Amino acid sequence: SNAMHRSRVSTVLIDVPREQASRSAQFWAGALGVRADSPPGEPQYVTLHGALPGLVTAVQALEEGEARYHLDIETDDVDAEVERLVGLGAVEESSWQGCRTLRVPGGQLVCVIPLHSDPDEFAARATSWP
């Protein structure tokens, strides 16, 4: 059933109500000793450059809801990866911050997102399914 495809955790997100976003980025920049800025086309994100090895880390401004963390699973087939994770007991929730979003067994949220990495890096770190 499940199409052959690849995935891995690519991104660690610090989700904060929009009003606290700049204060949060200020803290994490000082706490981690990192540079912080927003990418073009992504003003809701403040990248914490080089915070974690082999991953992207960012503060994401929430338009509604309470502060949390979440992980993004990067994949070359979003539909197939959502299907695979639902097969493992995850449940798809409403679109959340423009991402396909699942509640996993235990209660945490994860987002499934498309490719945003150097192909050679993704091939070196992604897990092949099945």
Residues that bind a second copy (CB under 8 A): 8-9, 12, 14, 16-17, 20-21, 23-24, 26-28, 30-33, 51-55, 59, 66-71, 73, 85, 88-90, 104-108, 110, 125, 127, 129
Least distance (Å) between residue 113 CB and a second copy: 14
Nearer to a second copy, 2 or 41 (CB): 2
DSSP string, 38-105: PPTT-TTEEEETT-STTSEEEEEEESSS--EEEEEEEES-HHHHHHHHHHTT-EE-S-BTTBEEEEPT
Least distance (Å) between residue 92 CB and a second copy: 14
- Asked if residue 12 lies in contact with residue 110, where contact means CB atoms within 8 angstroms, the answer is no
Nearer to a second copy, 28 or 45 (CB): 28
- Beta carbons within 8 Å of 97's beta carbon, 6+ residues apart: 15, 44, 60, 62, 63, 111
Nearer to a second copy, 51 or 80 (CB): 51
Least distance (Å) between residue 95 CB and a second copy: 20
- Beta carbons within 8 Å of 22's beta carbon, 6+ residues apart: none
Least distance (Å) between residue 1 CB and a second copy: 15
Q: CB 112: neighbour CB atoms within 10 A?
A: 24
Nearer to a second copy, 78 or 110 (CB): 110
